[PDB]
From a paper:
Peptides destined for display are first delivered into the endoplasmic reticulum (ER) by the transporter associated with antigen processing ([name]). [name] is a heteromeric ATP-binding cassette (ABC) transporter comprising two subunits, [name] and [name]. Each subunit has an N-terminal transmembrane domain (TMD0) that interacts with other components of the larger peptide-loading complex, a six-transmembrane helical domain (TMD) that forms the translocation pathway, and a nucleotide-binding domain (NBD) that hydrolyzes ATP. In this study, we analyzed the structure of [name] in the presence and absence of peptides. These structures show that [name] suspends peptides across its transmembrane cavity, anchoring their termini in two distal binding pockets primarily through their backbone atoms.
To understand how [name] recognizes peptide antigens, we analyzed the structures of [name] in complex with b27 and two other 9-mer peptides, all of which have optimal lengths for binding. These three peptides, b27, [name] (a2), and QYDDAVYKL (c4), are natural products of the antigen processing pathway and are presented by HLA-B27, HLA-A2, and HLA-C4, respectively. The structures of a2- and c4-bound [name] are essentially identical, having an overall rmsd of 0.8 Å. Nevertheless, the peptides are suspended in a central cavity surrounded by TMs 2-6 from both [name] and [name] in all three structures. When viewed from a perspective perpendicular to the membrane plane, each peptide stretches roughly 27 Å across the TM cavity. Despite their sequence diversity, the three 9-mer peptides are stabilized in the peptide-binding pocket by a common set of interactions involving backbone atoms on each end of the peptide. These interactions, including eight hydrogen bonds, a cation-π, and two van der Waals interactions, enable sequence-independent binding to [name]. At the N-terminal region, the free amino group of each peptide forms a cation-π interaction with [name] W308 and two hydrogen bonds with [name] E242 and D246. The terminal carboxyl group of all three peptides forms hydrogen bonds with [name] N269 and R273, as well as longer-range electrostatic interactions with [name] R210. Furthermore, [name] L377 forms van der Waals interactions with the N terminus of all three peptides, and R373 interacts with the main chain atoms of a2 and c4 but not b27.
Author numbering:
A (entry chain B): 131 to 681
B (entry chain C): 1 to 9
C (entry chain A): 183 to 271, 288 to 478, 494 to 742
Write the structure that this text describes.
């Protein structure tokens, strides 16, 4: 297919910045191929001089040359291996960086639709397989092709009537190798499917351990697992038998070709057309070719899978996001007035199934606006679309008589901030998490945010102060500290619009009395989302909405 | 059996 | 089996002995053409070499087949026993360990016997060259073992650094709404770039180590070959060794090199696989008479975490009973003791005049049935997932009658393909009321003498609760069975013959529903709330 050729062209364009390393590696490869081609000729000339009369000059010259060629081949092979390994690693690192940069620009709907494990497989092992195409597979393929051509040239130089027999014999070996490779691949993927089916049983058993323990059906589960194990064992036995039969066939064919070469070589020897060293070098050349052909077939088979993995990674990368045009606006001063004009929103995950319909209200800088009602957790949609996370299908949300799509990303998300019911924490320091997303923030701002959100209680004890190391995803803190750090993180930016989710239902009462009654709520629009009427004890403008419609 | 050839980088 | 392994050992010894005839006979044939022999001898060696090598290949095939057929059985039995042991208290590890150990042991034994036989024939051919090879073996092949440790250290540093970078990227991607809300995509890109920049230097070290390792591992063998060829040439000049013997040694040295290389490349993997492996009376009939006397139990974590104490609940046969109270009542321990899922740790208990563990396991599990607090359905059909654990397959009419009694007939009929409807794993796609009805049907299909159905109203609806109340309270003479319903539906607790409340692991109240609601117990406090 031309698609595979396009993929190879894209891979070459990716590997383009590593030109000098690849040139040096190819030159080292050529030197190694020449050295290992020329070694057995002198290895046979040593036997040639040893068999007949003794001449010290020829023996010394032959052993010196052979040692020199062996040393040169070893040195160049080591250099080629090092250069190719470095090139492969550089390619892997570059494509990992490019893939992460491309992935970070996609819309949230793609991340909701696509599971995390697929992205991890793309970024962990699938990106590694494409880095073995040029520095590994093309390397061994080219070296095997050139080695085979040179070896057959030398065998034709030695004796054509002995080379023609190998030429006739090789297609049988090629066909047998291809058939065995196809059968092995088929059996291997069947074995993988069977072992996945076997692991499904133990996953089901460990998932529902309480049920089976209550009903005492342990023997039934172990019988199902025994049946799955027998099904896998039959496939394993078939694979082993096929591999053993292939090895037996290969050994018999090697016997036949060796006997034919020996018989014809001795028949030509009796006419004086060959020497013992010539025959020995011919045996070494035949033994090398018989392995290099199979190496070539295996390497092509692996190159196909490498190209497939590269196709998967490139398909994952080349997705075009559905975000609107980037916004160039960013005023020095923002009033904070927000208007929704019949915004109507439907989730892109389930299109034509609207969640919001004809919503319309206005927000004031000095008036506190609260939202009430269960809504089936549908109140988070207006909070998400208020930060330009999801573009509205109908209507329009606007700030200061300007639509939200025309504002600069950093400026808009620095002027309008929000906290959810569940805070999300990273693996950095407390200072890192407080100043998250900030280009430069002094420790004084962190102190102000911590004392304004009443975090300094827990933070003061914290070893190494604020420079402590939080656990992964906040594993070293409880829910109260998570909420305190989240509200301090929101407060540290001095936002013109502040949105809170569950300010009293989930968040502490002290934080609700602090953030909603300080200077950050004196001249800034605050949108608090609560499922109860307790927020009515301080709210000014209360809005209730159910099933996508406002009362 | 036999050790399949590794033919590394 | 030891006998089959011994037979495989005999077969592999014979095959390794017979394989080596090719270089010996080609060297003898070159010597034969050197000294003007006869054609009868020539065809004799040709036929003998062909027969020996063919027999070696055939015996290799037979021995392999026997070894693989036995090791498959061994691995399957080990996996089954591991699963059976872990269920009455990893499997993928065990399977990978089993198959890797199998192939490693096969390669190790094959190449060890081949190397031993090769050493034997080479020593028979000429003492001097074999002694030289033996004395240059370890002093020249210890260096790959020295370099491989440094290489493995650098390579494992590479993989752990890559894994850490991948974990950082995955953590950044999993929290994408927060990153988009704080506009910190460039920060995550910068962190990823810093991780790769930290990787790069060590990676260069790894490349240099690869170059040095390849240099050493080729130069050692090449120098060994050069030295043995020079010594053989000097000896054949001296005349103590024939030239054909030199050809045989030239052909044998390569095979010995491959054998020792395979052994040294195999042994550490075998060692680490071994290190990974080192870590591993039936009752006739009953009326449902269940009685307790000061019964106590403890949590499985530690005996200090007491579950309950002083339990004397008398499950009246042919009547219902409701257990209420706060979380300190320990009704879960009472349910576990009724289902005999946990051993008692104090007091006395009896089921139909006999202790519950004293009876047969299958009979006790089939008689004293229970419904789980969280309903779950296994990944099977509704004719199986609603009859799991049954000794005999129920009839379709019987299963339909059970579903009708449990109210699951409509759910089964609405599903496609009738009773053979596909169900998701662990009841993921099933509704809460449907799952509760399926659990009730699974409990009622065994015709229990006592029902411990509780906590099913958390996911059930009001209609399901009304159906459960109609099945329980309005049962004909309770179907000659008892009940221990401890569900959260307080409406059905009023219809119970004798409700009770407990606190702190001990009973706190009891009596009739009106008496309990008029007393000072926890049930009255909940009613007055």
């Amino acid at each position: 297919q031309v698609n595979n050729k396009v993929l190879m062209w894209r891979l070459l364009k990716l590997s383009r910045p590593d030109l000098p390393l690849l040139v040096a590696a190819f030159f080292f490869l050529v030197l190694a191929v020449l050295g290992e081609t020329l070694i057995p000729h002198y290895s046979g000339r040593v036997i040639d001089i040893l068999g007949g009369d003794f001449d010290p000059h020829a023996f010394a010259s032959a052993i010196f040359f052979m040692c020199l060629f062996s040393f040169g081949s070893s040195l160049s092979a080591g250099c080629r291996g090092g250069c190719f390994t470095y090139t492969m690693s550089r390619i892997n690192l570059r494509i990992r960086e490019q893939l992460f940069s491309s992935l970070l620009r996609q819309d949230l709907g793609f991340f909701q639709e696509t599971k995390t494990g697929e992205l991890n497989s793309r970024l962990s092992s699938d990106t590694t397989l494409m880095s073995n195409w040029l520095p590994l597979n093309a390397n061994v393929l080219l070296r095997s092709l050139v080695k085979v051509v040179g070896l057959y040239g030398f065998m034709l130089s030695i004796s054509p009537r002995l080379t023609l027999l190998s030429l006739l014999h090789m297609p049988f070996t090629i066909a047998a190798e291809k058939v065995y490779n196809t059968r092995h691949q088929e059996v291997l993927r069947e074995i993988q499917d069977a072992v996945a089916r076997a692991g499904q049983v133990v996953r089901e058993a460990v998932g529902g351990l309480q049920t089976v323990r209550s009903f005492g059906a342990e023997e039934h589960e172990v019988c199902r697992y025994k049946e799955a194990l027998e099904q896998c064992r039959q496939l394993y036995w078939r694979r082993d038998l096929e591999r053993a039969l292939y090895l037996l066939v290969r050994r018999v064919l090697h016997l036949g070709v060796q006997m034919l070469m020996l018989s014809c070589g001795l028949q030509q020897m009796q006419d004086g057309e060959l020497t013992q060293g010539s025959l020995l070098s011919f045996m070494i050349y035949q033994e090398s070719v018989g392995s290099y052909v199979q190496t070539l077939v295996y390497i092509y088979g692996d190159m196909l899978s490498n190209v497939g993995a590269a196709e998967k990674v490139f398909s994952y990368m080349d997705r075009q996001p559905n975000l609107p045009s980037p916004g160039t606006l960013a005023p020095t001063t923002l009033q904070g007035v927000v208007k929704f004009q019949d915004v109507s929103f439907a989730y892109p995950n389930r299109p034509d199934r609207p969640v919001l319909k004809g919503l319309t209200f206005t927000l004031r800088p000095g008036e506190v606006t609260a939202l009430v009602g269960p809504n089936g957790s549908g109140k988070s949609t207006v909070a998400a679309l208020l930060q330009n996370l999801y573009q509205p299908t109908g209507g329009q949300v606007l700030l200061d008589e300007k639509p939200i799509s025309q504002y600069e990303h950093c400026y808009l998300h620095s002027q309008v901030v929000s906290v959810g019911q569940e805070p999300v924490l990273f693996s950095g320091s407390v200072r890192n998490n407080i100043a998250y997303g900030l280009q430069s923030c002094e420790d004084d701002k962190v102190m102000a945010a911590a004392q304004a959100a009443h975090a300094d209680d827990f933070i003061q004890e914290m070893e190494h102060g604020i420079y402590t190391d939080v656990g992964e995803k906040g594993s070293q803190l409880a829910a109260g500290q998570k909420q305190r750090l989240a509200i301090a993180r929101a407060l540290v930016r001095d936002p013109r619009v502040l949105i809170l989710d569950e300010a009293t239902s989930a968040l502490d009462v002290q934080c609700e009395q602090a953030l909603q009654d300080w200077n950050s709520r004196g001249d800034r629009t605050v949108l608090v989302i609560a499922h109860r009427l307790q927020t009515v004890q301080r709210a000014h403008q209360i809005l209730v909405l159910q099933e996508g419609k406002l009362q | 059996i036999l050790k399949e050839p590794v033919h590394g980088v | 089996e030891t006998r089959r392994l011994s037979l495989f050992l005999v077969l592999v010894v014979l095959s390794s002995l017979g394989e080596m005839a090719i270089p010996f006979f080609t060297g003898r044939l070159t010597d034969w053409i050197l000294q003007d022999g006869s054609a009868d001898t020539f065809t004799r060696n040709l036929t003998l070499m062909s027969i020996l090598t063919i027999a070696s290949a055939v015996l290799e095939f037979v021995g392999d087949g026997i070894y693989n057929n036995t090791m498959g059985h061994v691995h399957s039995h080990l996996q089954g026993e591991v699963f059976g042991a872990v269920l009455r208290q990893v499997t993928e590890d065990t399977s990978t360990l089993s198959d890797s150990l199998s192939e490693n042991l096969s390669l190790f034994l094959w190449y060890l016997v081949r190397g031993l036989c090769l050493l034997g024939i080479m020593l028979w051919g000429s003492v001097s060259l074999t002694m030289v090879t033996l004395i240059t073996l370890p002093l020249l092949f210890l260096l790959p073992k020295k370099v491989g440790k440094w290489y493995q250290l650098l390579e494992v540093q590479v993989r752990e650094s890559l894994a850490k970078s991948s974990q950082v990227a995955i953590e950044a991607l999993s929290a994408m709404p927060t990153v988009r809300s704080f506009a910190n995509e460039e920060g995550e890109a910068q962190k990823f770039r810093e991780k790769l920049q930290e990787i790069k230097t060590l990676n260069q070290k790894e490349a240099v180590a690869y170059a040095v390792n390849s240099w050493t591992t080729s130069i050692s063998g090449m120098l060994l070959k050069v030295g043995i060829l020079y010594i053989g040439g000097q000896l054949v000049t001296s005349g103590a060794v024939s030239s054909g013997n030199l050809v045989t040694f030239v052909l044998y040295q390569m095979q010995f090199t491959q054998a020792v290389e395979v052994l040294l490349s195999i042994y550490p993997r075998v060692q680490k696989a071994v290190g990974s492996s080192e870590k591993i009376l039936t009752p006739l009939h009953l009326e449902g008479l269940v009685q307790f006397q000061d019964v106590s139990f403890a949590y499985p974590n530690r005996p200090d975490v007491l579950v309950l104490q002083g339990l004397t609940f008398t499950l009246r046969p042919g009547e219902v009973t409701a257990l209420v109270g706060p979380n300190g009542s320990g009704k879960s321990t009472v349910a576990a003791l009724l289902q005999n899922l946990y051993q008692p740790t104090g007091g006395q208990l009896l089921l139909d005049g006999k202790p519950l563990p004293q009876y047969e396991h299958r009979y006790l599990h089939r008689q004293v049935a229970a419904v789980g607090q969280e309903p779950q359905v296994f990944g099977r059909s509704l004719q199986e997932n609603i009859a799991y654990g049954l000794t005999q397959k129920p009839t379709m009419e019987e299963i339909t009658a059970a579903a009708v009694k449990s109210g699951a007939h409509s759910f089964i009929s609405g599903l496609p393909q009738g009773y053979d409807t596909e169900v998701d794993e662990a009841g993921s796609q099933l509704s809460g009321g449907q799952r509760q009805a399926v659990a009730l049907a699974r409990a009622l299909i065994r015709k229990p003498c006592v029902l411990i159905l509780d906590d099913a109203t958390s996911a059930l609806d009001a209609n399901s609760q009304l159906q459960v109340e109609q099945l329980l309270y309005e049962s004909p003479e309770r179907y000659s069975r008892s009940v221990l319903l401890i569900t959260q539906h307080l409406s059905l607790v009023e219809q119970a013959d004798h409700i009770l409340f407990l606190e702190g692991g001990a009973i706190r109240e009891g009596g009739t529903h009106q008496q309990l609601m008029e007393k000072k117990g926890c049930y009255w406090a909940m009613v007055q709330a």
